[PDB]
């Protein structure tokens, strides 16, 4: 048990203690059944890893200064680029290569039943050969992943509000903090 999402409240009797990120947060009781809970642990770890990659990518694009995460498909809604170097491909070819590669990798992952923490060639540096620090890094992994999921939904909502990138909106929040937030928006709070 990593803590308590709301102190005073009790932990549900279906979430076991030896699980990465068990704050007891299940109001809707979605995982009272073990097969459902197994599938959701798998899905939570996969969503967390993809969201860490996506948030790190959007931060890297905007900090290195080639637009934001929203300007990146504008050549294809309309030439691609990467590290400023142009990449000689088109939308249909990219969708073909991505579909083949992700279908292959995803299909190899889906053949294994309940593999969440695979190791092996996925884990070349061998940090998870101790069975205790590996579990502490599982807890760090699920916390970073939940934080990056919240960060990416914040990116999407923040861009739907202001129409700007997250680093530029952070610059606005540092310049005029009481004049640039979700309430000068005019969208997040509909009044005034």
């Amino acid at each position: 048990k990593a803590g308590n999402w709301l102190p005073g409240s009790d932990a549900p009797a279906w979430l076991p203690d030896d699980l990465p990120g068990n704050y007891g947060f299940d109001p809707l009781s979605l995982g009272k059944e073990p097969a459902s809970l197994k599938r959701f642990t798998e899905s939570e770890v996969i969503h967390g890893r993809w969201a860490m990659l996506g948030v790190a990518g959007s931060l890297a694009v905007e900090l290195l200064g080639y637009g934001n995460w929203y300007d990146a498909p504008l050549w294809a809604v309309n030439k691609a680029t990467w590290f400023g170097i142009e990449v000689p491909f088109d939308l249909n070819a990219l969708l073909a290569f991505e579909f083949v590669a992700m279908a292959a990798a995803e299909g190899q992952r889906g053949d294994a039943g309940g593999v969440v923490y695979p190791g092996g060639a996925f884990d070349p540096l061998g940090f998870a050969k101790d069975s205790s620090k590996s579990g502490e890094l599982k807890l760090k992994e699920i916390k970073n992943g939940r934080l990056a999921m919240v960060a990416f939904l914040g990116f999407v909502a923040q861009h739907a509000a202001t129409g700007k990138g997250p680093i530029a909106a952070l610059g606005e929040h540092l310049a005029n903090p009481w004049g640039a937030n979700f309430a000068t928006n005019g969208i997040s709070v509909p009044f005034f």
Binding site: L6, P7, G8, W178, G179, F182, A183, T184, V189
Partner: protein, 203 residues
């Protein structure tokens, strides 16, 4: 038992355990004890915010007539600058009150379960829980020494009086179009030609 109307038959569920128990419930709204717990806590909360409201409407107007950033009336506080738009202040208000309000609600749901400081886990409210009457750091000057049967009753009497006073300020302002201390100054200048019936018929 001091009745709201002496000689009348009082509702049997009212027993003096609540502060200010005068047997007044003609609509029988407190029959269920669960609803009576909710209504007791809501009476306390509406009463305390109304006491702060009547203080915040009196004291700037009581200081505006005598010898201070603005002497603006209480219902024109929105049309003033306050270094920021009111929407951002609304957002800050809703975040900090989301925290405090849900913490009070978790105390009311499970009494004896919202007492210790979450960040600095040595700080703690004592075990005299009493939902609605926290204690500890909320009583910093060491009061409550008295039984509080008396202090709780004074608290609910001043609170009912200020709830009636704020329902006043809304009504008097919406009728007369003006400020309440100027309304009291007119009632002191000529009480016999300035009554509710006089102004209502002068409409």
């Amino acid at each position: 038992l001091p009745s709201w109307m002496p000689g009348a038959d009082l509702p049997g569920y009212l027993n003096g355990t609540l502060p200010g128990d005068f047997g007044f419930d003609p609509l029988y709204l407190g029959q269920d004890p669960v609803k009576l717990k909710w209504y007791a806590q809501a009476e306390l909360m509406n009463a305390r915010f109304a006491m702060l409201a009547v203080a915040g409407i009196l004291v700037p107007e009581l200081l505006s007539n005598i010898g201070p950033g603005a002497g603006v009336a209480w219902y024109d506080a929105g049309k003033f600058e306050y270094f920021a738009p009111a929407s951002s202040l609304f957002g800050v208000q809703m975040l900090l009150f989301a925290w405090v309000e849900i913490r009070r609600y978790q105390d009311f749901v499970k009494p004896g379960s919202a007492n210790q400081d979450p960040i600095f886990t040595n700080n703690k409210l004592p075990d005299g829980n009493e939902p609605g009457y926290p204690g500890g750091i909320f009583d910093p000057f060491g009061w409550s020494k008295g039984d509080i049967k008396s202090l709780k009753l004074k608290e609910i009497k001043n609170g009912r009086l200020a709830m009636l006073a704020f329902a006043g300020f809304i009504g008097q302002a919406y009728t007369t179009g003006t400020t309440p201390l100027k309304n009291l100054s007119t009632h002191l200048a000529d009480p016999w030609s300035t009554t509710v019936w006089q102004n209502d018929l002068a409409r």
